[PDB]
Amino acid sequence: DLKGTKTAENLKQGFIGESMANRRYLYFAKRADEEGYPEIAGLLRSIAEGETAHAFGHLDFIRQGGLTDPATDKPIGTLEQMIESAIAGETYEWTQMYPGFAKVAREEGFPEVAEWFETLARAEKSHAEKFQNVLKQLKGG
Amino acid sequence: DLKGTKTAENLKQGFIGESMANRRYLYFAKRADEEGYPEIAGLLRSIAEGETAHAFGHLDFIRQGGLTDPATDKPIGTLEQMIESAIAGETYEWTQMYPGFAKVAREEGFPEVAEWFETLARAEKSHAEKFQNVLKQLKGG
Ligand SMILES: [Cl-]
Ligand SMILES: [Cl-]
Known about the structure:
Chains A, B: Sulerythrin
Largest sheet of chain A: none
Bound molecules: chloride ion
Number of strands of chain A: 0
Keywords: Hydrogen peroxide, bi-metallic binding site, oxidoreductase
Number of domains of chain A: 1
Number of helices of chain A: 4
Entry title: sulerythrin without metals (apo-state)
Helix content of chain A: over 70%
PDB class: oxidoreductase
Shape of chain A: globular
Distance between the termini of chain A: 33 Å
Oligomer: homodimer
Radius of gyration of chain A: 18 Å
Order of helices and strands of chain A: HHHH
Assembly: dimeric
């Protein structure tokens, strides 16, 4: 009964925010590492494990409710569906999103940012190919 | 020169998507684990390390450009700023976001989802307190 509800939206938003929180806190922990704050770094890493649990619990409800992947709007019920979601998102990123970001970065006078986005387009293409090979393995039984 | 540009927006969007990709792929790897696909699971985990590198590189450009944290719109130049960003986001989540999500979940007839959001409000309150104690440690020199 979750499809089309505000609660469906809120689970998706929760997933986005918890995902960012884990990345942010681990990035902050690396700064603590460099500067010599190991107890702060360790606390950041442990809090980040909390954010993993929160993100994964949001995804559990999203699937239990027949809602789609926050990133791709594809189903993620089965493992094969999960890999198809990965392929769809990767294809978008390597063919469309990162090339477009690189072009705009060049247009706006940020060539180093553009080369980073071009690196990421190539990297996401490789990810897409790896996930396509996974799907072939799963569909072959 | 990045402030107010499309490239600033694109770095922020890139960070969001890479953050979700790492969480998604690790969630998918746990399903592969359970079902008995260890080579798929290991590949998912390795691809997820790629997404960490991509997310962190987006954050590097965001900081090098004097842009704010995608999650909180607070600066993240210094370690103290990073902890202040964590406190701001956590305060929002525990006081405002998760309580509101829980109330809406109850209004819409999803009591189990509501109890999950109430658990997360309490958890984020604890995170906020831990980060406040970190900031006190840093400001005390
Ligand atoms: Cl420390
Ligand atoms: Cl396998």
